[PDB]
Amino acid sequence: KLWVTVYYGVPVWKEATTTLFCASDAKAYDTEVHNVWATHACVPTDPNPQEVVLENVTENFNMWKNNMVEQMHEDIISLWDQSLKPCVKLTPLCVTLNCTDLRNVTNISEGMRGEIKNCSFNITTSIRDKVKKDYALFYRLDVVPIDNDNTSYRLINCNTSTITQACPKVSFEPIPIHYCTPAGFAILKCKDKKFNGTGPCKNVSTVQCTHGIRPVVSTQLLLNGSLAEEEVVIRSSNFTDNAKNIIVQLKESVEINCTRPNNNTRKSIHIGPGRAFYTTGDIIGDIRQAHCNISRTKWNNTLNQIATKLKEQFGNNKTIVFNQSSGGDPEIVMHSFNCGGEFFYCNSTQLFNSTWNFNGTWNLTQSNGTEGNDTITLPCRIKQIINMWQEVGKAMYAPPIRGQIRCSSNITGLILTRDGGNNHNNDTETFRPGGGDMRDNWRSELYKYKVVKIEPLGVAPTKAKR
Amino acid sequence: KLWVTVYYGVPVWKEATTTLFCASDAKAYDTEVHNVWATHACVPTDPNPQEVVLENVTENFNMWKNNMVEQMHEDIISLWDQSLKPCVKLTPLCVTLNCTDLRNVTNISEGMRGEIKNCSFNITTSIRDKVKKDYALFYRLDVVPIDNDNTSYRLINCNTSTITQACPKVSFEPIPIHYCTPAGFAILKCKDKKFNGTGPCKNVSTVQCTHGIRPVVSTQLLLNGSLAEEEVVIRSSNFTDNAKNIIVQLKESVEINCTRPNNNTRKSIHIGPGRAFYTTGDIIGDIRQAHCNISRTKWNNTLNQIATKLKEQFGNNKTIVFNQSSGGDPEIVMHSFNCGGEFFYCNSTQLFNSTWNFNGTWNLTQSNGTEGNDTITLPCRIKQIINMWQEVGKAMYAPPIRGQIRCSSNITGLILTRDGGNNHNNDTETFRPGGGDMRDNWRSELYKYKVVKIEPLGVAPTKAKR
Amino acid sequence: KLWVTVYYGVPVWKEATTTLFCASDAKAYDTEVHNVWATHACVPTDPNPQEVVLENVTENFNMWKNNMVEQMHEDIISLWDQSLKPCVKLTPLCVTLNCTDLRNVTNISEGMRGEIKNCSFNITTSIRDKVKKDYALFYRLDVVPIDNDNTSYRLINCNTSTITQACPKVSFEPIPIHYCTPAGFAILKCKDKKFNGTGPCKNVSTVQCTHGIRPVVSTQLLLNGSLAEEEVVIRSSNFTDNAKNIIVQLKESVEINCTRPNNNTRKSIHIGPGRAFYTTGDIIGDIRQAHCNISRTKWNNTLNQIATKLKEQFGNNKTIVFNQSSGGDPEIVMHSFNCGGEFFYCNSTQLFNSTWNFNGTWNLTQSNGTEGNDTITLPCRIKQIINMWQEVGKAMYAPPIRGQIRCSSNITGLILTRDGGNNHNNDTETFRPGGGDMRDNWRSELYKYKVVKIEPLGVAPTKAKR
Amino acid sequence: LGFLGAAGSTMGAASITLTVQARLLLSGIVQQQNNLLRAIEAQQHLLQLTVWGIKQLQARVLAVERYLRDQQLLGIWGCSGKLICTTAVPWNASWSNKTLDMIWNNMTWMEWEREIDNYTGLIYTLIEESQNQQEKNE
Amino acid sequence: LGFLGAAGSTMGAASITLTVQARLLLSGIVQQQNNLLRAIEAQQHLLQLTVWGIKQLQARVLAVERYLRDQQLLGIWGCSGKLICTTAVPWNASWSNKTLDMIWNNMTWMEWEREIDNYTGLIYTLIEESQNQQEKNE
Amino acid sequence: LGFLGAAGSTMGAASITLTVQARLLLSGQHLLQLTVWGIKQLQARVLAVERYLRDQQLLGIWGCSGKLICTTAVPWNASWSNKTLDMIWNNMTWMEWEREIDNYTGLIYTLIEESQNQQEKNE
Ligand SMILES: *[C@@H]1O[C@H](CO)[C@@H](O[C@@H]2O[C@H](CO)[C@@H](O[C@@H]3O[C@H](CO)[C@@H](O)[C@H](O[C@H]4O[C@H](CO)[C@@H](O)[C@H](O)[C@@H]4O[C@H]4O[C@H](CO)[C@@H](O)[C@H](O)[C@@H]4O)[C@@H]3O)[C@H](O)[C@H]2NC(C)=O)[C@H](O)[C@H]1NC(C)=O
Ligand SMILES: *[C@@H]1O[C@H](CO)[C@@H](O[C@@H]2O[C@H](CO)[C@@H](O[C@@H]3O[C@H](CO)[C@@H](O)[C@H](O)[C@@H]3O)[C@H](O)[C@H]2NC(C)=O)[C@H](O)[C@H]1NC(C)=O
Ligand SMILES: *[C@@H]1O[C@H](CO)[C@@H](O[C@@H]2O[C@H](CO)[C@@H](O[C@@H]3O[C@H](CO)[C@@H](O)[C@H](O)[C@@H]3O)[C@H](O)[C@H]2NC(C)=O)[C@H](O)[C@H]1NC(C)=O
Ligand SMILES: COc1ccnc2[nH]cc(C(=O)C(=O)N3CCN(C(=O)c4ccccc4)C[C@H]3C)c12
Ligand SMILES: *[C@@H]1O[C@H](CO)[C@@H](O[C@@H]2O[C@H](CO)[C@@H](O)[C@H](O)[C@H]2NC(C)=O)[C@H](O)[C@H]1NC(C)=O
Ligand SMILES: *[C@@H]1O[C@H](CO)[C@@H](O[C@@H]2O[C@H](CO)[C@@H](O)[C@H](O)[C@H]2NC(C)=O)[C@H](O)[C@H]1NC(C)=O
Ligand SMILES: *[C@@H]1O[C@H](CO)[C@@H](O)[C@H](O)[C@H]1NC(C)=O
């Protein structure tokens, strides 16, 4: 016969939900200037990560019902909300605008672009009685013609919602963040080389904190993200359901060199007591449109790796099409992202123009001597006013940045969307660029982790009497 | 000789104060009525309430200095304030109004009521140079004549303070709430059939959570409340102090059938980016004034019941008088309450017109065959703008409700006010309807409960040496 | 041989930092009047202070890097911000003003002072449609000549900084506050008769809480403050450095009698829905400048008391000089303080014009033949608009106070600044009134206290085996 | 569940049987209900600084404070064990000159615990000193 | 640090001289981490309330609540001593008609407890009764 | 006598009065609205709790589990400012004992808990 015996601290957990906090070690905290929203809050990261490897475990994972995704989704949203809340309100600047073409019709170097507009307008000063007729510069993407008049114009989202400009001191440069659980919980990491996103996992490890994510939001192509191993891996909730999105993770980084070749002046006008709207003073030199530099050979090779895996997914006998984006709002239709606090919108038509033949590929572009037409130049433009992706209202103006701007980053993943139709016997599966969701960018990064609560008390029948 | 011996968990409580939390079952959450001024914040109520009978205790109670009254008072105050705080601000609409008759002079069915006013006015929208001459509808109770010309009007509360309309999605239907103490405390319930409100109590029962209150605030009357047993009961701090109020608890429910016989249209006009004022579009059909249906004999017999208890209170040889209230602000002067998100103001005269003699009563009207002039019809009217009862600021506007409105509820209690004067030898004690206090409605509910802290540790000499 | 033995609850503490809370006593809560400062938030102070004297202790102190001085300053700033945050906003009243001399030219009793200005202006009323030309009385300090000419005026801060008037119901009368630590910490008090601010201390005591501070912000002077016992003590961060401020504590109180001999009317004008600007109605009777009354021989006794201690600091053979600050901000240049919610600015030039000599000093004023020219009378003036001392923004307005204002307070300490120059062989050390710092006022109050964490766990070898 | 129903019954009669049986029904059931409520609340989440979230947060903070305080009190004087604990302190008859039979089979807890509301502080401090003497011996 | 690697190991083999030492090492490590967190935060005073400040405070409150739950249970049924603890209730073999050696050499803690959850109610209630029993035997 | 009264006295006398300090650090205006000092007090009390439970945890994890006094099995290393007994008991204070046992105190703590695990392994 037996009497139960208890053991506190047995290896038992249970799939659960809880709250998490961040960690920004100390490199961001060292500067102590232009503090980013995340820097002045996160607890210093523990210098030595602990990753205990688990054996003889086949825990099931499913990233499409991962609680930590939604939680961190509303986290980032609320953080931006409070981070921008206290600074300037831009509601009084919504008036009629009297605009000219650019600085002058005198153009050398592209011609009539229309991207400056030299708009003039009557405004009220800090003193209630005093009023002044002032002028400012605006891009085509930041102004709508109104009253059927060549001179008349207004901001885009006046008749819709409100605007509050970004608050100038704070930087928009992301930093790594480590989610760490409170005691009594742990995070499980699926370490397998290949994982489709749902199912049992062989290589399982236990950690107390995630690796730095460095939160970046982009449309069409992931940036400064993580890399796959030995191949490109695709994840979908239901491949047969073409309505859902496709997640692509690449096995090599791709260097992207974007720049804004324009010398800028930050002219500051007051509209109130503390209200100091910041606009562009002028441009020194020619107006060269912002663009991104990309290698041709590398792009082909990586996109061909995608082609093979995508073929493998939906049966060998297929022909692949990469049509451009159907339409809609600017973010999803045309590649957009952030760089040095300036939001770039790049026309990636030439990026997706490919029709792999069931019988024409498997030969990469191995051009050794190139020294020439090898850079893919992207026509990129600027929008200063950006609204909430999901919320109809809640807009934000971007203050201009003085001087020259240039980033260079690491393309690590793509967002794809299959469109059905006449592809059954044609076998012409068409994939278009996607985006517009805040959760997917991070779904691409949190699939490997899942949280479990730790229940240490355990019972075992044993013949020992007290 | 003895040595003290200690016990942990002796039955010892003590008069105390603490914080409490709510428990709204699951039913409102099972309906997703979108956070009706207190839904998702409450913990699920325990399935099985525990009401341990107390024996051989004569615990004293006094409801007039029960603190939880005040605590839940301020709870309700802040809870309502935080619900209406994030939605629409309604200052800019305060202008001059140009108003007609009702909608039209074509009246069949009551004549010149004046309750629609088809008021027109110039206003400023989101874009602040396109003045819009718009119209809407308002009741005679909602609008004051400023400039006694003919068609010059303003919203009553523009001299006083500010207005913010109720936020349309949230409903107003109250739901039961259970106050529950944290551990280490308990609530004592006086279970006696008749209790005057202060003194020792014979039947005591300890629970941990109160029964659902379903917070309802009404004046001159108590609605969907609790019932007494075997008799009407009557409570007052100092009966001789005629200045204090009188709370009356009834032993039967009384059915009341109130309705708003008008088909309504919710016309929505924007005054800003997110600012969308909601007004009445029009009325389909005749304009029948809102009213409440009440049985005669029930009312008469229950009024007889109260009178007998009242001539037990102040000596047998008395003559009873029920004059209408003296005057003052609309709430206490004439009856008012809420129904389906519309605040009704019913003219309370036919109710309190009674002079039950010292020698004419003691026969209830048990009229069998009635089938006729048996319904007490109440002239009821609408006010859309309601202010804070105690503070002078903080007023709200009530959005119109489309379609037909109709409630039917259970009258359970009364508030009365003794007026002194020439009643000494006349013996003509006069009582009028009261109200205007947020506490008393709930004083009528929380009289039986009182909170006590539990300190378990107790000492007692005993001859046992360690 | 030995085995370590653990002991919980031993006298080891450690230099540390933590958070503190205030105590206002039960009586402040009992008054329950307008929640002056933070009367309710403060916990009721303990009836019985506990001050365990510590012997055999030489603990070092240094007040210049005591963190609680910084903590107290930030706490006071946050409390003031919370108090003024919901107060009426005063941004619209900033217009041109059309001003006469004061009221009338019928002066008797000082002549052309200019302190009323009976300024008229054009301002919008609560209703946007109606605009009414109103007036208001303003002190000469409040309005600067603007647009030159003679009859155009505007408030000192408009483009530079917004203004929000003090909420009227709250009062500024300070009350004692007791900082109390949470458990696990203690405060050490240096009880020595004379302490120069840094070094070891003999007489020490551990206390549960600090004594009431009754925070007072004053310039060039200290009012309602702690008094040194049996000596006058002079403290400075660097005696060698002239720039470092010098703090002088006194051993006797000095009675000061300030008043505002004018009978005032609070005329209230609305500028919005809840916006009710409060201005002065008029003055009943003659207009007399505010005047503080001070005894001669007593102030002089304290001037000689300073002299002796000062020439004991910087070497015997010196000649002492008292000069007023030649250039300063209006608060910094002359004396200012608060009284009954009215900020007085007095001309303390007759308190700082003394040239103490090396010979003939040490003889006090024993004038028995007084009853006469024995009162130093201070020319004092009024400013209603006061701005953050440090931040260039956030200015407040003082509402006028009806009737007569009078104070009588307790002068206890000084702030002085040494100025270097031709004083080496001249030996003419010159000292000037100081101020303008929020910390220094409370640096004197918290000099004797310092906080230490308490770590109970200690380990010590002992030969006992388990 | 398992609340105090022995208050009416004389201190002694409750102490002999009811206090022992109720002890666990008072220590475990109350804590288990609190644990279940916390677990459902944590899984539900929606814990924002709203009018209600702050209230229940303070509620559970108070609960843990009161429980921990009792454990510290029992632990400091040697009741690191359970309900029943003797002591070395002799009960001074000057505090209360009453026979055990009257104290146990005539008088209850509430009435008696109020009667010592002057001697109680003296009693506890003496318990601490006796505990120190036991520490010296061992 | 010190997280148990016995999650894949067979409950019985892991329990005997393979997991007991690690369990206490894990507790010591979590205690050290908590101490490091509470000291650095007190030195920085960066705990001012903000979204992240609320998120970390709640997490700390949850952690202490949970640990106190575990210790509370552990004490209230008589195991105030160490992780391993016996008890008096005979194990009704009906719950799982299975033999000891096979279970110890083949079954692991996670899969073990998930098919015991039905009878865990019964065993814990029997335990509290055994506590009552021995306390009214003493 | 007193919260820090023992300080001046030698460690041995401090041990006799060490229970008055053990009663301090108890860590216990019931409503806590988000106003000013109210929340300051809430944060302060929340800290104090961790302080106690940290010290409590160490005690239980060590071979002590029981307050005010607990003895061990690790021999005291000469290297750890060894003196005599009359020196370390009748001559010097807890406050300034920490001064020389400070880098050693951490070494001693690691020693005690390793031995405590080792004795559990032997049992
Ligand atoms: C605060 O207290 C101080 C201390 O009492 C007051 O200032 C003191 O003022 C006295 C003078 O009233 C002064 O004593 C003089 O000291 C000088 C150097 O030590 C001496 O030179 C002087 O002798 C005479 O000559 C001076 C001119 O050189 C004259 O100014 C002075 O009045 C003396 O005059 C002599 O002759 C006349 C006519 O015959 C006769 O009436 C006089 O009595 C005298 O015989 C004095 O000895 C102190 O040195 C001063 N002390 C300080 C510290 O300054 C000060 O006024 C008080 N302030 C207030 C507001 O009350
Ligand atoms: C509601 O209940 C009351 C209580 O019965 C009813 O009141 C009254 O009933 C009596 C008996 O019918 C009436 O008395 C009459 O007295 C006069 C003079 O004494 C005389 O004509 C007869 O003796 C007659 O019985 C009495 O008038 C009547 N009211 C009074 C003043 O007490 C009452 O009718 C009920 N109904 C309603 C709807 O009010
Ligand atoms: C300060 O300036 C204000 C103006 O802002 C003066 O107020 C105005 O004073 C005049 C003269 O008394 C008032 O007119 C008078 O009205 C009465 C009543 O109808 C009438 O009988 C007189 O014949 C005369 O017309 C005027 O109403 C008043 N306006 C306001 C808004 O108060 C004020 O007198 C000045 N005070 C001083 C001391 O200079
Ligand atoms: C008018 O409201 C407000 C407007 C602005 N700021 C506010 N701050 C608190 C408010 C109230 O809570 C309040 O004053 N109210 C009165 C009592 N009330 C009722 O339900 C009720 C109304 C009429 C008759 C009987 C009961 C709830 C609410 C409407 C408040
Ligand atoms: C309350 O008091 C009554 C009256 O003494 C108790 O009823 C008696 O209790 C005793 C012992 O408790 C029994 O021996 C009697 O048989 C009971 N009956 C009578 C005569 O009333 C009652 O039990 C007490 N309640 C408690 C538990 O406090
Ligand atoms: C502080 O230390 C001094 C010095 O040891 C103590 O004074 C001695 O106290 C003992 C007993 O109380 C006397 O026998 C000695 O004559 C005292 N003087 C000496 C040794 O010079 C003092 O008691 C200590 N006080 C505290 C509070 O610790
Ligand atoms: C346990 O006993 C039951 C009796 O019905 C039997 O069916 C079951 O097989 C037994 N378990 C084993 C594995 O022997």
Residue numbers in the entry:
A (entry chain C), B (entry chain A), C (entry chain E): 33 to 140, 144 to 146, 150 to 309, 312 to 321, 321A, 322 to 395, 395A, 396 to 464, ...
D (entry chain B), E (entry chain D): 520 to 657
F (entry chain F): 520 to 547, 563 to 657
From the primary publication:
The resulting mature Env, which consists of a gp120 exterior subunit and a gp41 transmembrane subunit in each of the three protomers, is incorporated into budding virions. During virus entry, gp120 engages the target cell receptors, CD4 and CCR5 (or CXCR4), and gp41 fuses the viral and cell membranes. Here, we present cryo-EM structures at near-atomic resolution of two cleaved full-length HIV-1 Env trimers purified from cell membranes in styrene-maleic acid lipid nanoparticles without antibodies or receptors. Cleaved and uncleaved Env trimers assumed remarkably consistent yet distinct asymmetric conformations, with one smaller and two larger opening angles.
Processing of the AD8 data likewise yielded two Env trimer conformations; only the major conformation (herein designated AD8) with higher resolution was refined to completion, with an average resolution of 4.1 Å. Aligning the gp120 subunits generated interprotomer Cα root mean square deviations (RMSDs) of 0.24–0.33 Å for the AD8 trimer and 0.78–0.82 Å for the AE2.1 trimer. The α9 helices in the three aligned protomers of the AD8 Env trimers exhibit rotations of up to 7.4°. By contrast, in the interprotomer interface with the smaller opening angle, HR1N forms a loop that is well resolved in the AE2.1 Env; in the AD8 Env, the density associated with this loop is weaker, likely indicating a higher level of dynamics. Alignment of the AD8 Env with the uncleaved HIV-1JR-FL Env(–) trimer again demonstrated similarities in the overall fold of the protomers, opening angles, and asymmetric topology. In the AD8 and AE2.1 maps, densities of approximately equal intensities corresponding to BMS-806 are evident in all three protomers. To evaluate the potential impact of the asymmetry observed in the AD8 and AE2 Env trimers on antibody binding, we docked several Env–antibody complex structures onto models of the asymmetric AD8 trimer and the symmetric HIV-1BG505 SOSIP trimer. For the AD8 Env, docking was performed on a protomer (Chain E) flanking a more open interface. In general, bNAbs were able to be docked onto both the AD8 and SOSIP trimers with no or minimal clashes, whereas poorly neutralizing antibodies (pNAbs) encountered severe clashes with the adjacent protomer.
